[PDB]
Design a protein around this ligand. Structure first.
Ligand code: BCL
Ligand code: BCL
Ligand SMILES: CC[C@H]1c2cc3[nH]c4c(c3C)C(=O)[C@H](C(=O)OC)c4c3nc(cc4[nH]c(cc(n2)[C@@H]1C)c(C(C)=O)c4C)[C@@H](C)[C@@H]3CCC(=O)OC/C=C(\C)CCC[C@H](C)CCC[C@H](C)CCCC(C)C
Ligand SMILES: CC[C@H]1c2cc3[nH]c4c(c3C)C(=O)[C@H](C(=O)OC)c4c3nc(cc4[nH]c(cc(n2)[C@@H]1C)c(C(C)=O)c4C)[C@@H](C)[C@@H]3CCC(=O)OC/C=C(\C)CCC[C@H](C)CCC[C@H](C)CCCC(C)C
Ligand SMILES: CC(C)=CCC/C(C)=C/CC/C(C)=C/CC/C(C)=C\CC/C(C)=C/CC/C(C)=C/CC/C(C)=C/CC/C(C)=C/CC1=C(C)C(=O)c2ccccc2C1=O
Ligand SMILES: CCCCCCCCCCCCCCCC(=O)OC[C@H](COP(=O)(O)OCCN)OC(=O)CCCCCCCCCCCCCCC
Ligand SMILES: COC(C)(C)C/C=C/C(C)=C/C=C/C(C)=C/C=C/C(C)=C/C=C\C=C(C)\C=C\C=C(C)\C=C\C=C(C)\C=C\CC(C)(C)OC
Ligand code: HEM
Ligand code: HEM
Ligand code: HEM
Ligand code: HEM
Ligand SMILES: CCCCCCCCO[C@@H]1[C@@H](O)[C@H](O)[C@@H](CO)O[C@H]1O
Ligand SMILES: CCCCCCCCO[C@@H]1[C@@H](O)[C@H](O)[C@@H](CO)O[C@H]1O
Ligand SMILES: CCCCCCCCCCCC[N+](C)(C)[O-]
Ligand SMILES: [Fe+3]
Lengths: 238, 318, 280, 310
């Protein structure tokens, strides 16, 4: 027809494009599908190293009840957390149940471990040793002090700070991402939670390591405080 | 207030990392690590072990040759005065064979030099490719990189080698120079009736703009979920965490859909690769299939029309 | 409908303004006060773009009127109007639609803020997004201000705006010579490279050669150290990519910003300062 | 690089992007730098014609003595006010053509006369005068010559002019932005009139030459490509501005000036007026316009001297 080659080349592309999106929208569904009342792609298997295991995606995961109740029966309505908001494990305090194994270095040793275990590690020349500083919650009260430092042995860095809580002398983790330093005073400010809240931070089923399961529970705890650490945070700003 | 995860406030050291052990037939790993408190402020401070086999070395050499052929020429064009060479460097360049030659091989001083800088450059490029291919198998990994690089080469090759040859004229290739290669860019569009109306030029922009939209999206996202250790994209793909969850939901709630920790990197890979592919296709058809893109767009009812507030009598029409 | 792990996060509260009033979802989208204001700006925005197509550049009966998607165009007012409001059919429409686009875009960002507050995650995304809104604002608001007229803004048409870019650049004879422009392009290019590099790396480890098991972070770095003797690491590469992309938007914003308001001559001429150095 | 607010002018339809920007500060200084020298009082226009009282008057023939003298008084200040009458004359022998500056001047009365009477499609009723290019100087500040910058040009060059008459002289010149288009007459057009390919041989090199030439023209007139084009279609005359038409006739006008007015005088001009290649200082757009869309902001000087018309 009055059809030119530039035309037919644009058709081919778009044909490959549409086909592409489809492939991509199928991979977008290797997690979280089928939805809660592009098709699903046949499972793909990941072969974990060392001891290992085997993950498939998409997989069928058993539902886990929600620790909250519909603020309203209308669909699309939010839910209120049950009990003491920070205890809930709902909303910003939520988290899934990741494996109860530890992430491993290439050799296969608990990757994330404290400086009292990765013998080698060491603070950096011009940088304060966090060890021994005072942790202060969102309002100011002291919380405890840094009893140690957990690090990644694969990609050398501080992932967590160990925290000996005063109020109970228990050791809890604090992700670096939630900790701001104030070197010129040697403090480790913490907007996440209040001094008191440090008492309920999930604890380690071994003081020489943390599991994927345990990492989430920790961060999630602190995160919850971002909306549940105050009765005004949780509310508007208007 | 809140740490933004932009600058590591406290770094830590451990013996440098020599890397994973390579298999059967991989020379030692030259160079010995060093650190730099400052690189560390924004990233892994280890500056370390480089691998150099036949390939990679054979690539730097040829690669420096072409760069060398280009420079002396630039030195030659300004009469060999290194003062003048330095002063006008931006405007210097080594142009491709003139049209008179078609695809004949001309004397060095009449384009043969361009072909030699082209020959060796490509050679060094096609060699770094192989380099990046070896290095990824020795580690059991896949060839996603070498296949993306192969994508950028295709555009490069199309510019200076494929299109000229199909068109039977080295003079259609790109000149080696900073400002000169810029002038070529503008003239090329002028010569072919405005490249804005080239459909594949439009697609490549969308893909170039989108690659900026995407990286900004993925990067800001992964940082915003770093508190939950979202950067460890490796285990979140195998063992989905609240990071991959807070992430996917930020998007589902924003734009109605979302990806996965793994799949987002496929949207990214593909969005980048299609930038150079639609580009070469775009240049491939230029002059070869279409001669005036604006007109083509008119033939396809795509060009906007405006009230004629300004017009000029055509003198050619006495 | 929700993902199979989404309910545990659909908490109540986290708003900025409004509280329980609009704190709900519709399908997968979270609404919020900013979902309502945003939708209002968009709708009047779109509905106005529709009536404009209806009227055409001359009249609803004109031969220039069109409903073809490539040719529809809503253009700014003449420059003769300066910073004044222009008659609807003489650039008025464009003036209103712009306010809506800005209101629509700013709400979207503000809506990402509430969504972030609800998840206890950082606000990097809406921070980064405001860079695209700034670029848009510089093109449609700031620049036209420094120049003294709204007509300096680009028109709203799929291809007509490409006609604008073309004619604004060539006003400078050779726009490629804009130094800020050269910077932005380098960023756009470098980003596209990094993005492809990041993409490739992850999928290469989470999916290696057959037989092999999922790779590790050490591999990532061992490869990137192998190829170019350095690896910036997981965290930082996401840090880098965001830098490049935001920078692309920034230098794009200044490149046009300096073109007209602070530099009126051709662009190749700017480079004279280099041919006049005393070094020579 | 300072500014706010810049001067601006709308050229095309709103939204199309065809507008012009400039520094007011410098536009005012420029206006001050391009002032025309005021005219001389009218001349008693009675009596015999110059050609009746003089012996070697081959051009300003039909002018009255008074107007003739006046024309001489004006042309002096316009070309060589510091040298006076004696610049183009042999003392004691006003009629002798025994000095190159008289043979050239005579020829330059014909260049102007021609400009004003035959090239109105370009110069309209504004016209030109000696002052236009000279600005009180014996050697026009903006006359040009094919000079070798410190860099080597592309050995390639538009194919001469597509001719072989008095062209052996152009063969000794390397490539230069202007000569091949505003002296010789090679093809500037490269854009095709058909969408599909297989029928347009213009080269990319040709594209660059036309782009180059155009950058010169713009700079010479102190404008941007939108003063004449709609860059979405450079070749489209219906989408262009009436200045493009005018610039077209200007390109020919300048070709006629250089070819039949400057080059022929090449044998009677001293070496000091020729470039390293032996070519003479000739005319380009800069020569008259000197960075303004209209020489001396379009001041109308010529209308006062009838001696400058055929
Ligand atoms: C006035 C001129 C024209 C114009 C002319 C062109 C031309 C001509 C081309 C483009 C092309 C592109 N343009 Mg443009 N373009 C214009 C206006 C625009 C605008 C705009 C906002 O106005 C945008 C954003 C675009 C956008 C783009 C890109 C999408 C695209 C380039 C892809 C790329 O990744 O390059 C960067 C990528 C590469 C070059 C790959 C590099 C690969 C190799 C392997 C690396 C080698 C390095 C080497 C070893 C180093 C050593 C060298 C020695 C030192 C010597 N253009 C106007 C309309 N456009 C390209 C296209 O797609 O056209 C169809 C193209 O060819
Ligand atoms: C012939 C003219 C010139 C020229 C003229 C111009 C001019 C003039 C301009 C540029 C600008 C740009 N050019 Mg150019 N340019 C040329 C050649 C090039 C080449 C090339 C390969 O030759 C390149 C790569 C570039 C590169 C670039 C970029 C640096 C820059 C545009 C990016 C941007 O602004 O993002 C910034 C991003 C945005 C503005 C987008 C904001 C998006 C918003 C707010 C949200 C949108 C939502 C939407 C409405 C909803 C849709 C969703 C659906 C509902 C589902 N140009 C030629 C030489 N260049 C422009 C610039 O720098 O602008 C700042 C500019 O104005
Ligand atoms: C599709 C996505 C894009 C993309 C992708 C891409 N590029 C890539 C890759 C990928 C996936 C690689 O794997 C490869 C890479 O990064 O390898 C480590 C690369 C690469 N992309 C590069 C450049 C590049 N990519 C570009 C664009 C793009 N690349 C696209 C946007 C551009 C442009 C024009 O925008 C450029 C400039 C290189 C960094 C690299 C490939 C380099 C290469 O092949 O090696 C050739 C070798 C030599 C020339 C030797 C140089 C070695 C010398 C030691 C240094 C010389 C400098 C000298 C000191 C100056 C003075 C000279 C002396 C002699 C006096
Ligand atoms: C600085 C980084 C870059 C960037 C970042 C960025 N963009 C973003 C984000 C981020 C981080 C988001 O979070 C947000 C998003 O939700 O992405 C999925 C977004 C986004 N970037 C988008 C587009 C986009 N970004 C672009 C560029 C960039 N985005 C930069 C490169 C471009 C271009 C031109 O390069 C486009 C087109 C959207 C997908 C999305 C913004 C969604 C949104 O704001 O929705 C609200 C508004 C509407 C649904 C429509 C309103 C329409 C009107 C009221 C009238 C329209 C008038 C209009 C101005 C004229 C028509 C334009 C003509 C030119 C064609
Ligand atoms: C009436 C109603 C529905 C109420 C809702 C409230 C609203 C939306 C108000 C605003 C107003 C109005 C009227 C809007 C209507 C619009 C509708 C129905 C939807 C919105 C439109 C919109 C902006 C669409 C954009 C679509 C595009 C092309 C986006 C470009 C980016 C792109 C190509 C993305 C594909 C890749 C993806 C999915 C990226 C997200 C993404 C990233 C970046 C990750 O890093 C990440 C990491 C780990 C897990 C997942 C992810 C992930 O999903
Ligand atoms: C005049 C032009 C205006 C339009 C502009 C077009 C821009 C692209 C489209 C924007 C998406 C709209 C709303 C999002 C989906 C939604 O809101 O609803 C949800 C549906 C249903 O997903 P699900 O039920 O399977 O699972 C529940 C999870 N959503 O999402 C999808 O299937 C995925 C859609 C992704 C497609 C993105 C690819 C864009 C193609 C580009 C088109 C041309 C541009 C040039 C680029 C090369
Ligand atoms: C004096 O100099 C010293 C000694 C100090 C050295 C320093 C050198 C310097 C300063 C160099 C500077 C170089 C610069 C600035 C280079 C810039 C280059 C740019 C901007 C290039 C841009 C684009 C180039 C392209 C697209 C070219 C592509 C060319 C290709 C693909 C050519 C391929 C050619 C082939 C395959 C030839 C095959 C040969 C045969 C004969 C087999 O073909 C039939
Ligand atoms: C100085 C004020 C001045 C005078 C006086 C003057 C006079 C003059 C006469 C009388 C003639 C006619 C000679 C004859 O008998 O043929 C004449 C002719 C020409 N002039 Fe003149 N002129 C004066 C100044 C100048 C200057 C500064 C120039 C050149 C820039 C100049 C040029 C000429 C030319 C040429 C002619 C020839 C006229 C013709 O052929 O029609 N003179 N001069
Ligand atoms: C005006 C009627 C006019 C006169 C008179 C005139 C005279 C003139 C002379 C005497 C020379 C020779 C100078 C020398 O010493 O070599 C000369 C040379 C050039 N001119 Fe002329 N000229 C008059 C008008 C114009 C106009 C309007 C232009 C521009 C289109 C023009 C251009 C030139 C050029 C070029 C030269 C050669 C350069 C040189 O020899 O100085 N003049 N002019
Ligand atoms: C701006 C720096 C500028 C450019 C670029 C430009 C380009 C251009 C092209 C590519 C052509 C050839 C079109 C074709 O192939 O048919 C062309 C031709 C003409 N132009 Fe030019 N032009 C730019 C600037 C200007 C300006 C400022 C003017 C006006 C003074 C102008 C004029 C013209 C004219 C006249 C032509 C026609 C030439 C002919 O027919 O021989 N341009 N321009
Ligand atoms: C050189 C090739 C050249 C070009 C191009 C050119 C263009 C040009 C235009 C577009 C105009 C009109 C500007 C407007 O309408 O705003 C114009 C006007 C005049 N020109 Fe010119 N011109 C070129 C060269 C020359 C040369 C060498 C001379 C000198 C003899 C000259 C002179 C003039 C004059 C006088 C005018 C004014 C006309 C008017 O409308 O008042 N030009 N030119
Ligand atoms: C009409 C043809 C549509 C083309 C389908 C586009 C999907 C391409 O997607 C490809 C797969 O096909 C490929 O096998 C994998 C493996 O890593 O890489 C993907 O990126
Ligand atoms: C990235 C967004 C670009 C959207 C592309 C717009 C294409 C418009 O689609 C056009 C219609 O508007 C037109 O009237 C018909 C019928 O001949 O042809 C279609 O291709
Ligand atoms: C970006 C365009 C939107 C901004 C529009 C601004 C309009 C301001 C109108 C104030 C002047 C009033 N009036 C009556 C003279 O038009
Ligand atoms: Fe990532």
């Amino acid at each position: 027809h009055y059809i030119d080659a530039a035309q037919i080349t644009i058709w081919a592309f778009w044909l490959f494009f549409f086909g592409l999106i489809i492939y991509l929208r199928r991979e977008d569904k290797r997690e979280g599908y089928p939805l809660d009342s592009p098709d699903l792609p046949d499972p793909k298997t990941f072969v974990l190293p060392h001891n290992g295991g085997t993950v498939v995606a998409p997989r069928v995961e058993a539902p886990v009840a929600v620790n909250a109740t519909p603020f309203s029966p209308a669909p699309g309505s939010p839910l209120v957390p049950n009990g003491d908001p920070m205890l809930s494990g709902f909303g910003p305090a939520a988290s899934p149940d990741r494996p109860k194994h530890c992430d491993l270095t290439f050799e296969g040793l608990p990757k994330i471990v404290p400086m009292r275990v990765a013998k080698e590690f060491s603070i950096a020349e011009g940088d304060p040793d966090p060890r021994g500083m005072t942790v202060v919650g969102l309002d100011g009260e002291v919380a405890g002090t840094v009893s140690d430092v957990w690090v990644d042995r694969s990609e050398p860095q501080i992932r967590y700070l160990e925290v000996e809580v005063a109020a109970n002398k228990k050791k809890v983790l604090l992700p670096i991402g939630f900790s701001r330093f104030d070197k010129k005073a040697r403090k480790v400010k913490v907007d996440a939670i209040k001094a008191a809240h440090f008492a309920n931070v999930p604890t380690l089923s071994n003081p020489d390591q943390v599991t994927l399961y345990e990492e989430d529970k920790v961060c999630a705890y602190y995160a919850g405080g971002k909306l549940y650490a105050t009765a005004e945070r949780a509310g508007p700003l208007l | 207030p809140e740490y933004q995860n932009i600058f590591t406030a406290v770094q830590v050291r451990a013996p440098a990392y020599p890397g994973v052990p390579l298999p059967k037939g991989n020379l030692p790993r030259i160079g010995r690590p060093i650190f730099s408190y400052w690189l560390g402020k924004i990233g892994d401070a280890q500056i370390g072990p480089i691998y150099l086999g036949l390939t990679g070395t054979l690539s730097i050499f040829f690669g420096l040759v072409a760069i060398s052929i280009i420079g002396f020429n630039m030195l030659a064009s300004v009469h060999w005065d290194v003062f003048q060479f330095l002063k006008h460097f931006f405007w210097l360049g080594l142009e491709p064979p003139p049209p008179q030659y078609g695809l004949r091989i001309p004397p060095l001083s009449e384009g043969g030099w361009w072909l030699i800088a082209g020959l060796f450059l490509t050679l060094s490029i096609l060699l770094w490719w192989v380099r990046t291919y070896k290095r990824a198998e020795a580690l059991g990994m896949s060839q996603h990189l070498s296949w993306a690089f192969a994508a950028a080469i295709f555009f490069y090759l199309v510019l200076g080698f494929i299109r000229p040859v199909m068109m039977g004229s080295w003079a259609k290739a790109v000149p080696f120079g900073i400002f000169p290669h810029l002038d070529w860019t503008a003239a090329f569009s002028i010569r072919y009736g405005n490249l804005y109306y080239n459909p594949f030029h439009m697609l490549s922009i969308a893909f170039l703009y989108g690659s900026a939209l995407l990286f900004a999206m993925h990067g800001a996202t992964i940082l915003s979920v770093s508190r939950f250790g979202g950067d460890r994209e490796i285990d979140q793909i195998t063992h989905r965490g609240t990071a991959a969850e807070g992430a996917a939901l930020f998007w589902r709630w924003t734009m109605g859909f979302n990806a996965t920790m793994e799949s987002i990197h496929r949207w990214a890979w593909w969005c980048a690769v299609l930038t150079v592919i639609t580009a070469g296709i775009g240049i491939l058809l230029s002059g070869t299939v279409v001669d005036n893109w604006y007109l083509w767009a008119v033939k396809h009812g795509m060009a906007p029309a405006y009230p004629e507030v300004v017009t000029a009598v055509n003198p050619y029409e006495t | 409908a929700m993902l199979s792990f989404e309910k545990k996060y659909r908490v109540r509260g986290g708003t900025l303004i409004g509280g329980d009033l609009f704190d709900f979802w519709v399908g997968p989208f979270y609404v919020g006060f900013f979902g309502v204001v945003g939708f209002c700006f968009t709708l009047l925005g779109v509905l106005l773009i529709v009536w404009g197509a209806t009227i055409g550049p001359t009249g609803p009966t004109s031969d220039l009127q069109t409903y073809n998607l490539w040719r529809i165009s809503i253009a700014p007012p003449d420059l003769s109007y300066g910073l004044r409001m222009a008659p609807l059919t003489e650039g008025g429409l464009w003036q209103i639609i712009t306010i809506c686009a800005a209101g629509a875009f700013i709400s979207w960002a503000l809506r990402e803020v509430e969504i972030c507050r609800k998840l206890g995650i950082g606000f990097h995304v809406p921070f980064a997004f405001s860079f695209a809104i700034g670029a848009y604002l510089v093109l449609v608001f700031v620049r036209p201000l420094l120049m003294g007229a709204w007509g300096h803004g680009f028109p709203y048409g799929i291809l007509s705006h490409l006609d604008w870019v073309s004619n604004v650049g060539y006003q400078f004879l050779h726009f490629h010579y804009n130094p800020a422009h050269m910077l932005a392009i380098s960023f756009f290019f470098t980003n596209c490279l990094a993005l492809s590099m990041h993409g490739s790396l992850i999928l290469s480890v989470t999916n290696p050669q057959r037989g092999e098991p999922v790779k590790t972070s050490e591999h990532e770095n061992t490869f990137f150290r192998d190829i170019v003797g350095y690896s910036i690491g997981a965290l930082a590469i996401h840090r880098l990519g965001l830098f490049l992309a935001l920078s692309a938007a920034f230098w794009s914003a200044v490149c046009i910003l300096i073109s007209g308001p602070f530099w009126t001559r051709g662009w190749p001429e700017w480079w004279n300062w280099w041919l006049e150095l005393p070094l020579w | 690089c300072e500014g706010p607010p810049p001067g601006t002018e709308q050229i095309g339809y709103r939204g199309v992007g065809m507008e012009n920007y400039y520094v007011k500060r410098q536009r005012a200084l420029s206006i001050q730098a391009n002032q025309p020298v005021e005219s001389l009082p009218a001349a008693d226009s009675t009596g015999p014609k110059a050609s009746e009282v003089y012996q070697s008057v081959q051009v300003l023939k039909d002018l009255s003595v008074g107007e003739f003298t006046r024309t001489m008084v004006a042309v002096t200040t316009w070309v060589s006010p510091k040298e006076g009458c004696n610049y183009c004359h042999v003392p004691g022998n006003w009629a002798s053509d025994d000095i190159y500056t008289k043979v050239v001047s005579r020829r330059m009365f014909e260049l102007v006369r021609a400009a004003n009477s035959d090239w109105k499609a370009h110069v309209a009723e504004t016209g030109v005068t000696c002052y236009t290019c000279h600005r009180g100087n014996p050697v026009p500040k903006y006359a040009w010559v094919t000079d070798p910058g410190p860099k080597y040009p592309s050995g390639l060059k538009p194919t001469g002019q597509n001719y072989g008459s008095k062209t052996v002289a152009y063969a000794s010149l390397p490539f230069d932005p202007l000569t091949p288009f505003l002296d010789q007459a090679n093809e500037i057009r490269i854009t095709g009139n058909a969408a599909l390919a297989g029928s347009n041989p213009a080269s990319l090199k040709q594209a660059e030459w036309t782009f180059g030439l155009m950058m010169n023209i713009s700079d010479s007139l102190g404008v941007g490509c939108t003063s004449c084009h709609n860059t979405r279609a450079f070749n489209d005359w219906t989408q262009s501005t009436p200045k493009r038409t005018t610039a077209w006739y200007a390109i020919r006008h300048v070709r006629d000036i250089n070819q039949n007015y400057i080059w022929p005088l090449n044998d009677v001009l001293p070496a000091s007026r020729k470039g390293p290649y032996g070519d003479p200082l000739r005319v380009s757009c800069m020569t008259c316009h000197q960075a303004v869309n209209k020489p001396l902001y379009g001041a109308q000087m010529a209308k006062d001297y009838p001696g400058l018309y055929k």
